[model samples]
Each structure stands twice: as C-alpha cells, then as structure tokens.
Target: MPIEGKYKLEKSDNFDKFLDELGVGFMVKTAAKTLKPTLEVDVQGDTYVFRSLSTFKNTEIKFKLGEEFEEDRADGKRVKTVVNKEGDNKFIQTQYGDKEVKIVRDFQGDDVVVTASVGNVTSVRTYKRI
Candidate 1:
C-alpha cells in the first residue's frame, strides 16, 4: 500500500478540458496536449514528495497526510493543498482556492490511474511505473 514509484505518462483523455476549466490559454493547452509527463513519488516517514516532469514544465510538491501546504500546480496557480489516503493504495489530493481541483490516484499493478476534476470538467490520465 506504499505509493512510492516513478510513473510515466502513457495516455490521457479530457485533460484539455480540465485545463480549460482552469482558464489556461490556447498555447499552453496545445503544448500540454502533446507533452508526455512523468511523475515520481518519494515517501519518507510522514512526508511525501511528488515530482511531475514534462518537456513544457516541471513541478515539485511536498506534503504530509492530513496536512495542508501551499504549492504551485502545473497550471501555474498557487493554492492550499491537502493529501489524503482514500484506501489501500489510492490517494486523493485537493487544491483549494479560487480554482479548486480534486485529483484521485489509484495504483494498480504497475500502473497509476489518475482522475482530475475541476469545476465541471473531469479528465482521466494513466501512468505506467518505470
């Protein structure tokens, strides 16, 4: 149930819609649509660090379970972030502010399936452990 690994983006659907929900511009949306993103998770004690890397930009986030922290999202917005364990290997993260986002990650086998929701837009992205 330890959610620590490096995952490479395999496929995504509706992600552009999610970005649109965040009011991202056309150029950024186009770049994100074709970018292959990688997520690396590191767990140590009660802290977890996530590194999201892509050709367009990279983001690093650190937080603990049930604790609130501030971090900048891929969309270049800063917000208060909270991480929570849903079940076993599934994790949920919520970013709060003017634009709120909910991200759910379900780890299965060597894959991490992610669903992100913002406003009324929801997107599904899949990642394979590498």
Candidate 2:
C-alpha cells in the first residue's frame, strides 16, 4: 500500500468525548489530548510496523492482518488488537478486552484521517504527511 509514511498529528476533534467514555481521569485525559504524536506506518514483507512517537512515550507493535496481537497501549491498557487492511488506503482496527474500541484510518492524498470510537463516543484525529 502507498499509505506507508511518517505523518504528524495536525488536529483532533472530540477527543475529550472519546476519553470520557473510557472513564479517563482529568490529568491523564489532559495529557493524552495535548500530546501531538508522530505516527509512522511501515510494512516489510507481510508484517506491518505501527509506531507512535511522542515525548511521553514511544510505542510500537508489529502485526499481520487477521492475526490478533496483544498490545500495551500508551494508556497502559492491554488489548487484543486486530487490524485488517481494507482495499488500498484504509485500515480497520478493532481492540478487544475493553470498551471495544474501533479505529478506522482512511487515507486521502497526503493525509490520513483516523476515526476513533469507543462504545458510544467517537473522535477524529487527522495526520498529514511530513
């Protein structure tokens, strides 16, 4: 896929609502919302490299589509995640062992727009190529 690139967080909307559904605390939610992390997606062979780089913490995990992998999220939650590549420029990810968060990434030109939803709340995080 041509979606492999280093993208910087441009802006987000309704992140607080997304966090509120998770029962995230005031301080933690504030920290989570304020951090503008760099998201890099790379693929080698059939394995995909998903990395989030930030001053607070840099986390990465390698996985294949249809295979469930355990990930220690930046928020410290352990979830079984499965990411399936849909078509050429879309990634549909579902995280289990929690509120059943669904994260969808759709690429358009130089930007990848992420849609994050947990239970009833939803948020949008947009990242532009760097």
Candidate 3:
C-alpha cells in the first residue's frame, strides 16, 4: 500500500496506439516514444502529488484520493480526473472528457505496472524503483 517512491520507466507496449486514441499529434507522440520517463508519487494522508519528468515534458498533478478534480493534462486539455484505490496496492486514475482515459497502476514486488486505456486502445507500461 505504500507506493510513495521514485520510479523509472522500463517498458512501454502499445503506447503509440494509446496516444493516438487520445488525439495526440504525431510529432509529440514520436518524441514521447523514446523517452524513459521518471515519475515520483508522493502521498500524505489523502493528498497525493504525482510528478512526471522526461525530455519531452515535466508535469505535476496534485489531488486528493477519491475526489474529483479538474486539471490540465499534457495535451493541454482540462478534464475532470479522479484517483481511486481498487485494492491494496492497485490504483486507478481516470480522466473524463469527450474521450475518457483510464490509467490503472498495480504494484508488484519492487516494480509497478501500469495499464492505460483510451477508447479501445490500451497500453502497458512497467516501472522499476529508482
């Protein structure tokens, strides 16, 4: 249940398709394709801050678990987002808009695997602790 740590991207599968489903541009997607992004998830009680860093972009999102909030994504769209716990070490973060994007994260051992779905396109990304 303790997922507060820094992580480095190890693998990403079907990520281009997932970005396409979200209407991302080809250039941006291409830039993101090669990035080994780093992320830090910080949690203090119900408040959570997710920091994402890469050569393409760096983004930070702050919210309370289980509460809906509006935030701007990397694509420059403001959407309603919510983070919810599915079980002990699994959490789902959903963005609701004209098109919805759901990102599910599961902690396994010293790694975290994330599955992202937008429409019918889905992608899997694995991260290891840094």
Candidate 4:
C-alpha cells in the first residue's frame, strides 16, 4: 500500500543479458556493470510521474494508468510504454520496442521487488524504500 515513495536499487541479476536483449551494444553493457539506479513514484494533479534516477541518465515519465505513451528507454530505444495497475501496490509495465519488455514492481514489506524481462532473459532488481 505504500508504493508511492523513493526507492534505491539494492541488487540486480542478469543485467548484461537483459541489456543485450534491449539492443544495448557491447560497450554500453560493459559500462553497465555498476548500475544502481534510484526511482521515485509521485502524483501531481490528476497525473502520476515516475522518475528514473541514475548517475548516467535520468528518465521521467508522466501518465495515467492504462494510457500508452512513447518514450525512449534507458538504452535509448524508442518504445511504446504502458503502465497498468495490478494490485494495491503492484505495477505492470510493458515496453514495446527493440523486443517486448516487461517490468513488474511489487511492493513487499520495506522493499519494492522488480522483475524485468526482455525476450526469454529475465532480470531481477530489488529496491529498498527510501
């Protein structure tokens, strides 16, 4: 129920494989070894904004659930994205582009567990509430 807050990435697995599937080249994947990104979920007026913060890049998206929007992912691949509300604190994100990507965030206790998948490769990242 407390999903709208800042989150700091704590751990990740299958990072390179996921990046490779998203059309990220070798050089970029090489530099992605230490990608501990932070994020924030906020509401303004009648819209919701999700912010992806990192030392390398910052991506922000504003929209309402179920509405599709076009935006470039962290890899710079332009994709049509949609955020769907699943449960009280669970979010399903679909990105259509260089391959269909799915990211789901489920709030568990004091952490937001995120599972990202590109093709058959799945990456898991855990973010603690901040």
In terms of lDDT, model 3 sits at: 0.87
lDDT for model 1, on a 0 to 1 scale? Answer: 0.87
The TM-score measured for candidate 4 stands at 0.90
Residue lDDT tens for model 2, 1-130: 5778899999999998898997766776888878998889998989998889998789998899889999898777888999998887888889886589999989886999999999889999999999
Model 2, total clashes = 0
Cα lDDT of all candidates, in order?
Answer: 0.87, 0.88, 0.87, 0.83
Query: 31-50, model 3: which lDDT tens digit per residue?
Result: 88888998788988778888
List, residue by residue over 68-123, the lDDT tens digit for candidate 1: 99988666667898989886778899988787889998888789999999888999
* Model 1 residue 73 lDDT score: 68
Candidate 4 lDDT by residue in tens digits, 41-122: 8886657788889887888888888999987766667789999988667889999865888999887878988999988999
Judged by lDDT relative to the true structure, which candidate is superior, 3 or 4?
3
Report, for all candidates in order, the number of backbone clashes.
Answer: 0, 0, 0, 0
Model 1 Cα shift for residue 44 (angstroms): 0.8
Model 3 worst lDDT window (10 residues): 70-79
TM-score of 2: 0.93
